[PDB]
Design an enzyme around this catalytic site. Structure first.
Site: not given
Ligand SMILES: CCCCNc1c(-c2ccc(OCC(=O)O)cc2)nc2ccc(Br)cn12
Ligand SMILES: CCCCNc1c(-c2ccc(OCC(=O)O)cc2)nc2ccc(Br)cn12
Ligand SMILES: CCCCNc1c(-c2ccc(OCC(=O)O)cc2)nc2ccc(Br)cn12
Ligand SMILES: CCCCNc1c(-c2ccc(OCC(=O)O)cc2)nc2ccc(Br)cn12
Ligand SMILES: C[S@](=O)(CC[C@H](N)C(=O)O)=NP(=O)(O)O
Ligand SMILES: C[S@](=O)(CC[C@H](N)C(=O)O)=NP(=O)(O)O
Ligand SMILES: C[S@](=O)(CC[C@H](N)C(=O)O)=NP(=O)(O)O
Ligand SMILES: C[S@](=O)(CC[C@H](N)C(=O)O)=NP(=O)(O)O
Ligand SMILES: [Cl-]
Ligand SMILES: [Cl-]
Ligand SMILES: [Cl-]
Ligand SMILES: [Cl-]
Ligand SMILES: [Mg+2]
Ligand SMILES: [Mg+2]
Ligand SMILES: [Mg+2]
Ligand SMILES: [Mg+2]
Ligand SMILES: [Mg+2]
Ligand SMILES: [Mg+2]
Ligand SMILES: [Mg+2]
Ligand SMILES: [Mg+2]
Ligand SMILES: [Mg+2]
Ligand SMILES: [Mg+2]
Ligand SMILES: [Mg+2]
Ligand SMILES: [Mg+2]
Ligand SMILES: [Mg+2]
Ligand SMILES: [Mg+2]
Lengths: 475, 475, 475, 243
Positions: A51, A130, A132, A216, A224, A273, A344, A363, A365
C-alpha cells in the site's frame, strides 16, 4: 551477489522468514514478512505488492498499489529475531510500467551513482559516515490544549548526580558523566562499555567492517560506532542497517536509543559527519601535495559546491526542525559555511591523514541522522559535482576557533541557516543542481517541500513552547 | 480426507483429546471435548449430541437436542493445549431425520458451493481474505444505571507517549506508534515482530499456506497476516481457525486480541477484505484484456451484483453495530458503493496484477471480521451470482480519492449504509437473491433479523452514549 | 412594562450591574454585563453590539456584528450575584436595517404570537410546562482514542446502597431512592426537601407564581417544580429563567443539575410536558361538554395537527440524540402517537379537569428540555394551527396502557421516531406548516438541520459506544 | 497617553483582583493550543478642534479619506509595526487561522477575520472608527499606541491607499485568492529584522529615537528570540525521537 546466492544463503542458514524492506521518503525503513516457503524466483521476476498510500511521501489512496523488486546485495541475517530471518532491501517500482519510482530513496542513490559516471568526472563516490546517538533509559512527552512536556533520562546523566536512588530504587553510585565530559573516560565513568561491545559484535556479525566504538561528548550515554566507508548506495544501505542494529541492540538490553540531532539542551548534539572522496579508474582524485590541506582542485571545487549550495542542500542533510537546535555554537557542530583543516568548529573539516593520496578526503560536518541517507548522500554528491562542473571556489579557509571570532570577522562569513523553513524556502527557489541528469525530479522536490511544511514546520510553529511561559506568563 | 486418515493422524500424534467444534449463528466457534478413547467409528456413524437451546440462533428449549457429524477435512492438531488435542469441525444435523440443519453456518457454505455448480456459471469460487486485528494489552468496560465506560490499552498506543512508566512500572522507552502510522516501520517502532512470528509459526504448524505478515496502520498494535486463498467452505473454515490461533497465540503471550471493526476512535478500523474470483473447468473467468482494469463481462456483472445488493448484503458482511463506526471517511474503509482499480478508498478495489489471467480478481473491502464468515462469503457469492444471472452492470468506476470529494459531488454516488438497523430493515424487505437455490432459507433470514434487533440494535439504542453527556449535560 | 419602569426598578433596588441576555439557536441563554451607569436611554434607542459569529446558529465571521434591543417585560433581579444585578432579555436585530433577526428564537416566538392573531382562530396561546430535572452531586465524562466514559452520582442514588461511606467519608445512612421509587415519599427518603424549598423561594422572589414542587420518579434526585402557565413568548422566557434559577440554586448549594432527557439508564427520563390551550376575546376555545374528554373541535383538530406533524415537529420538541433514549417504553414517556384522557403512557393526555371550560386543555407529553423553548412552543403552535386550519382529525383515542398493547393492535398505531436523524430528515422533507406566515423561515430551518447533523448526529455516530465493547470485543 | 496609563492600571487591577481571590491571570497572547488567543484590539480615531475626522457618508464603511489613509499606513507598515504591537515570540502563535485573529493584511467592515475591522456604528460621525485587531497585550502599551499612531500618520501624509477591502471569511479564501493578499508576519524575528531595515516613520519628529529602536531590537534578539530558538520544543520529540 546474485539471486541464487541469496537462495543458497536462505537454505544454508535454515531461514524461516524473509523480511522485505524498503525506505519511506522521510528516511524510516518499512517492512513486512513472508515465510521462507514464499521466497522463490517469482519474488525476483514479478515482485511483491504494498500500500503506497500508507507510506509517507509515496502515493495517494486512489493510486495506492506499488511494487517491490529485491536487491540481492543487501541480504543479511537478522541478529534479533528468535525465528531465523533474512532481511533484504527492495527497490520500489510502478506496478504497470515496472519502471523505478521517482520517490524511492534507493532509486535516487542509484541515479546519483549513474549520473556521476556519465559526467566523466569520477566513477566512484565514497561515503564514510559517523552517525552519533544517545543511549537513554527512558523518554516521554505529550502535547495537550493546556500543556506539553518532554523528558529524557539516563542513569549517567549529570542531572541525576543528586538523585537519592536510581530509577529502580538501587543506590546512586556516582560516576555520572559531566556535561560535555563523555569523550571518553574509562569505566566506571563510561557506563556503556558492555552494551557498545554488543553493538559492535552485532554489526560484525551482520557483515560490517568495524573501525571503532566510543562514548561521545554528551552526558547521558552519547555514543559513536564507525564502520568502513563504501560507495554511495552501499553506504546509505549500511547506514539504515546500522541504525536498525544500534536501536534494537539497545532495546533488547533494556535501553532506548535516539538519533535525533539535539535531544539535550546545553550538551553536544548528534551529528552525521560525512567523509567524502571521488575516485576514477581505481585512483584517488582528491589529492594535490601543493594544495591547501593537500587538496586537489577537484576536491576544492567539490567543497565549493557544498558551501555554495548549503542554503538549499541542508533541506536534505539537516531535514528536521530539531536539526537547527544542533547548529548553535560551542558543541563541535557548524555555525557558518567555511572549510578548514583539523578544525572541528568548521562546516567542512579536512582531517589530518598525511601524504597518502588514497586517504585524502573532506569531512562535511553539517549533516545529521534525522532524515534519509539515500537522499542526503545523493544531494551532497550533486552539490559537489555542480561545484566541480562550474569550478566554484570556496571562500578562503579559516584556521581559527569559529565560535570565538570577533563580531566583525564573523559578519563577513555566511552563517548556517537558522531554521528548517528557511532551507525549504530556499530549496523551492533554487534546486537546479539537484535535477541535473534527472537524479532528483520535480515531483520529489515538490513532495519533500510539501511534506516538511505540512507535517513538521507548521505543527511545531503553531504550538506554544514551554520557554514562552517562562518568558511571558506574567506580561 | 477420510475417517481412516483422521484416526491415523490421532494415533500418530498420540492424541489424548478430541475437540468437537461447530459454529453458532453469529459466528463464534463452539466446543466440547471427548477423550481419545471415545473417538471411534461411532462418532462418524451416529454423531454426537448437544444442547441446541444454549447456542445462539439455534433451537428453543423444548426442541433442544441437536446432532453433530464430523467433517474429516477439518482435522488439525491444537497448538495450545498441553494435553495433546485434535480439533475437528462438525456439521449440525436434525437428530430425528439426520438432515443438515438450515441454521448451521457450515451447511450454508456447503449449499452455496453446490448452488454455484448448479448454475453452470462456474464450478469454483475462490476467496482470499485479509482479517486485520489489534494486539492489545488490556480491555475493560461496563454499563450501569449511572455510568458506562470502555478502555483498551496497548504499550505501543500513541495515547501513552506521556506515560511516566509502563503498566508494570518499567520505564517508558518511546518508539510508540503514531495514529495512522503503524504501516509499517521496522522495530523497535514495530513492537510486535516476535509475537507475529509466533502467530505465523502456529499457523504454519496448523497447515496454513502463509503469504505474509505485517503491522497495520493503527496505533496500539494493529496487525495483518495473510494465508493462501481457497474455495468458499475451506476458506471460511480457515478463517475461523485463523481467528482462534491468533487469539490464543496472543493470550499465551500476555496479550489480548480483538477483531472488532472499530475499537479505536480516530484511527484505522479492522476490515476483512475478500478477494474473489470464479473459475470453471480449471480456467479463470475474471479476465479480459480489453476491459477496464482487465475485467471480463462476468467479473463486471459479479461486481454489479455486490454493489447493487450492498444495502442488504451488508447485513451479513458488516453485521454489527460497531461495523458502521468503521464505514466513515479517512481510514481506508469504504464510504460509498464504487469500484475502482488501485483504489483503497473504494468499496471494490481491483488490485494491480498484470496480464496473468489467473491472478485477475476483485477485492471487496466492505466486509469486516465481526460476524460469520460462512454466511458472509455465502451472501457475497449469492449477490455476485445474481449480478451475473441478471447481467447487472456496475456504475462507472470512479478513480478518485473518494474521501476528498466535495459534499455536492459525494452526494451523487450511492453511500454505504449509515447503521446496522438500516441494513437489517433492507434485508427484511429484499432478500430473494439469497434464497435462490435454497442457499439461505426464510427461517435463517428471519432468525438473523430478530437476533440482531433484539440482542444488538436495541440494547445499544437504549443506552446513553458518553458523548451525549459531552453534548448535553448542560442543556 | 415600559423602559421607565425598568429604570425605576434598577434605581429602587440600587442595582450595580445589568446583565444583557439573549438566546442562542440551540437554546442556551447568552450574557454580558454592563455597569448600571451604562444602562441608559441609549440602550433602548441604539441597542448593544455583540459578536454574532461566536453564537451558535447565528453569523459567519465576515458578517459578525449584530445588535441587541431590550425587552422591558423580562427585567428581574438576579438572586445569586453578590453585586446587585438586574437581568434583562433582548431581541436580536440586524445592525444595518435594525430589522428583527430571522434566527433569533425570541423573534420566532414573537412572530408565532402575531401569526396566531392574524389567522382569527385565537388571540392567545397559553403554555404550561413541566420541566423535570435531576439534582446530582457530580458528573464526569470524556472521549479519547482508546476509551470513553461518563458517570453521574448522587447520594440518593440506588447504585450507592452498598457504599462503605459517602463521597466525603461520612457514613452511609441508607434511605436512598429505589429506581422508579422517587415519587414521592417523605423525608428522609426524599433527601432534597430543603434544597427544593430554596428553589421554590428563589423562583417566588423572581416573580413566578408557583403551584408545586416535588421529588420525581427517578432515583438520584429527580425533581419537578411547576409555575403558572402564560402566553407563548412569556412562557418561553419563563422557562429559560426557570432553568437558570434551578441550575444556579443547586450550584450555590453544592449540587449540579441536568435537564438532559435521559441521564440514567433504567430509570425515568426528564420530560417537558406542555399543557396548551387557545383563547380568544377572553374566552376559552378548547371545551365542549359533548366531545370526548370534553374537547371541542378546535382542541381535537389542534391535537390532530400535533400527532400528524409529530414526525417533523419532534425536530424542535425533542431536538437531541439523547431525547430518543427517553422515548422508550416503561417510564411515563410516549412511545407512539395517540391521545387519551388520564393516560400517562400517551403522547397527548387530557388531564382530568371537570366541567370548567376554562381549565380544559391538552398535555403534549413528548417534548423534553434539551433544546429551545421559543422554537419548541412556536413549532407546536404552528402544528396545531395547521391542524385547525385543515381540520385534521386525530385517530381515535386509545384508553389503555400503551406499553402493554398486543402486537397486532400496537402495529396499527404510528410510533414515535426512533432517532434524531429520522426527525431531521423528515423536517427537511416537510416543513411547510412551519413557514406559514413567515414564522419559521427557510434559513432558520436549514441552519437547524445543518447544525444537528454536523454538531450532534455525526459526532455521536462516529464514536464507538461502550456497550459495543460488551457485545463485540470477542467477535 | 491616558489610554496607555489606563491599560497598565487595568492589567494591575485584573491581575491582583484575581490573585486576592485565589486565581492567577495571564495576558499572554496564546496560552492554550487549539483555543482562542488573547488580543488587544485597538479602536482608533483622530479628532481636530473637537470634531471627528474619520467619517464620510459616501466612503466604503462610512470612512473618510483621512481614515482610509490611516488604515493604509497601518497595513503598509505592519511588517515592522508588529515589533511594537505583537512584540513576543508567543504573539505569533496567536496569528494563525480559525480564532478570530488576523492572518493577512486586509480591512473589512463587520469582519472579525480581518486585520482591520470597521465596526458597524451607523451614521453618527463621532462613533466612526477603525479596529486594529492584530495587537496583543504582551508588550508595552505606551510604545504600541505610539507606534500605531506614527504608522497611521505616515499613511495620511503620503496618502497611502490600502488594498481594496475583502468582505469574506479570510480563513477560507481559495488558494489563488489567498496567495494574492499579503500575509501577517510568521515570527517575531521577521518583524524585528524588518523594523531594523525600515523604521523611518517611527523616528519622524523624534517620537521614537534610534537608541530606543536599537535597544528594542537587541533586547528581543538576546532575551527572547535566541533563547526560545536554542531550546528543543516538546513536539520535536513527538516528531523526531524515533528518526
Ligand atoms: C579504495 C578506496 C580508499 C578510500 N580512502 C579512504 C581511506 C583510506 C585510508 C588509508 C589507506 O591506506 C592504505 C593505502 O593505500 O596504503 C587507504 C584508504 N579511509 C577513508 C575514510 C573515508 C573515506 Br570517504 C575514504 N577513505
Ligand atoms: C488455482 C486458482 C488461482 C487463483 N488466483 C489467485 C492468485 C494467483 C496469483 C498468481 C498466479 O500465478 C501463477 C500462474 O498461474 O502462473 C496464479 C494465481 N492469487 C490469488 C489471490 C486471491 C484469489 Br481469490 C485468487 N488468487
Ligand atoms: C385565563 C386563562 C386560564 C387558562 N386555564 C388554565 C387553568 C385554569 C384552572 C382553573 C381555573 O379555574 C378558575 C375559574 O375560571 O373558575 C381556570 C383556569 N389551568 C391551566 C393550566 C395550564 C394551561 Br395551558 C391553562 N390553564
Ligand atoms: C469625544 C470623542 C468621541 C469618540 N468616539 C467614540 C465613541 C462614541 C460612541 C457614541 C457616541 O455618541 C454620542 C453622540 O455624539 O451623540 C459618541 C462617541 N465610541 C468610541 C469607542 C472607541 C473610540 Br477610539 C472612539 N469612540
Ligand atoms: C567529537 S566530535 O567532534 C563531536 C561532533 C558533534 N557531536 C556534532 O554535533 O557534530 N565528533 P568526531 O570527533 O567523531 O568527528
Ligand atoms: C492498508 S489497508 O488498506 C487498511 C484497511 C483498513 N484497515 C480497513 O479496511 O478498515 N489494507 P490492505 O493494504 O491490507 O488491503
Ligand atoms: C410522573 S410523570 O408522569 C413522569 C414523566 C416522565 N419523567 C417523562 O419522561 O415524561 N410526570 P407528571 O405527573 O408530572 O406529568
Ligand atoms: C470575540 S472576539 O472577536 C475574539 C478575539 C480573539 N480573542 C483575538 O485573539 O483577537 N473579540 P471582540 O468581539 O471582543 O472584538
Ligand atoms: Cl522552521
Ligand atoms: Cl443501529
Ligand atoms: Cl441520530
Ligand atoms: Cl522568532
Ligand atoms: Mg568520529
Ligand atoms: Mg563524533
Ligand atoms: Mg557494488
Ligand atoms: Mg567526524
Ligand atoms: Mg492486505
Ligand atoms: Mg490490511
Ligand atoms: Mg475440497
Ligand atoms: Mg486488502
Ligand atoms: Mg407534573
Ligand atoms: Mg412530572
Ligand atoms: Mg403580555
Ligand atoms: Mg405532566
Ligand atoms: Mg488630558
Ligand atoms: Mg474587538
Amino acid at each position: 551477489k546474485t539471486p541464487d546466492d541469496v537462495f543458497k544463503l536462505a537454505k544454508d542458514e535454515k531461514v524461516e522468514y524473509v523480511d522485505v524492506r524498503f525506505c519511506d521518503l522521510p528516511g524510516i525503513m518499512q517492512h513486512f514478512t513472508i515465510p521462507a516457503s514464499a521466497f522463490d524466483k517469482s519474488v525476483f521476476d514479478d515482485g511483491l505488492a504494498f500500500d503506497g498510500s500508507s507510506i509517507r511521501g509515496f502515493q495517494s489512496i486512489h493510486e495506492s498499489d506499488m511494487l517491490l523488486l529485491p536487491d540481492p546485495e543487501t541480504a543479511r541475517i537478522d541478529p534479533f529475531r528468535a525465528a531465523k530471518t533474512l532481511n533484504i532491501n527492495f527497490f520500489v517500482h510502478d506496478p504497470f510500467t515496472l519502471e523505478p519510482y521517482s520517490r524511492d530513496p534507493r532509486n535516487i542513490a542509484r541515479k546519483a551513482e549513474n549520473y556521476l559516471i556519465s559526467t566523466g568526472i569520477a566513477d566512484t563516490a565514497y561515503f564514510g559516515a559517523e552517525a552519533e546517538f544517545y543511549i537513554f533509559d527512558s523518554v516521554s512527552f505529550d502535547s495537550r490544549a493546556n500543556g506539553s512536556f518532554y523528558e529524557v533520562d539516563a542513569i549517567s546523566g549529570w542531572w541525576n548526580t543528586g538523585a537519592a536512588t536510581e530509577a529502580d530504587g538501587s543506590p546512586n553510585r556516582g560516576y555520572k558523566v559531566r556535561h560535555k565530559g563523555g569523550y571518553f573516560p574509562v569505566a566506571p565513568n563510561d557506563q556503556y562499555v558492555d552494551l557498545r561491545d554488543k553493538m559492535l559484535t552485532n554489526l560484525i556479525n551482520s557483515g560490517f567492517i568495524l573501525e571503532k566504538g566510543h562514548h561521545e561528548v554528551g552526558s547521558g550515554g552519547q555514543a559513536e560506532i564507525n564502520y568502513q566507508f563504501n560507495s554511495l548506495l552501499h553506504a546509505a544501505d549500511d547506514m539504515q542497517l546500522y541504525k536498525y542494529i544500534i536501536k534494537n541492540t539497545a532495546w533488547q538490553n533494556g535501553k532506548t536509543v535516539t538519533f535525533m540531532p539535539k535531544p539535550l539542551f546545553g550538551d553536544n548534539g548528534s551529528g552525521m559527519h560525512c567523509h567524502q572522496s571521488l575516485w576514477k579508474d581505481g585512483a584517488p582524485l582528491m589529492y594535490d601535495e601543493t594544495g591547501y590541506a593537500g587538496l586537489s582542485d577537484t576536491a576544492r571545487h567539490y567543497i565549493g559546491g557544498l558551501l555554495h549550495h548549503a542554503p538549499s542542500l541542508l533541506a536534505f542533510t539537516n531535514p528536521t526542525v530539531n536539526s537547527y537546535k544542533r547548529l548553535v555554537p560551542g558543541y563541535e557542530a557548524p555555525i557558518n559555511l567555511v572549510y578548514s583543516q583539523r578544525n572541528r568548529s568548521a562546516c567542512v573539516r579536512i582531517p589530518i591523514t598525511g601524504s597518502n593520496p588514497k586517504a585524502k578526503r573532506l569531512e562535511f560536518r553539517s549533516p545529521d541522522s534525522s532524515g534519509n541517507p539515500y537522499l542526503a548522500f545523493s544531494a551532497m554528491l550533486m552539490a559537489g559535482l555542480d561545484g566541480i562542473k562550474n569550478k566554484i571556489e570556496p571562500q578562503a579557509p579559516v584556521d581559527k576557533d569559529l565560535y570565538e571570532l570577533p563580531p566583525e570577522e564573523a559578519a563577513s562569513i555566511p552563517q548556517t541557516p537558522t531554521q528548517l523553513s528557511d532551507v525549504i524556502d530556499r530549496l523551492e527557489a533554487d534546486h537546479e543542481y539537484l535535477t541535473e541528469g534527472g537524479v532528483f525530479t520535480n515531483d520529489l522536490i515538490e513532495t519533500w517541500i510539501s511534506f516538511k511544511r505540512e507535517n513538521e514546520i507548521e505543527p511545531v510553529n503553531i504550538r506554544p513552547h514551554p520557554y514562552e511561559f517562562a518568558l511571558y506568563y506574567d506580561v
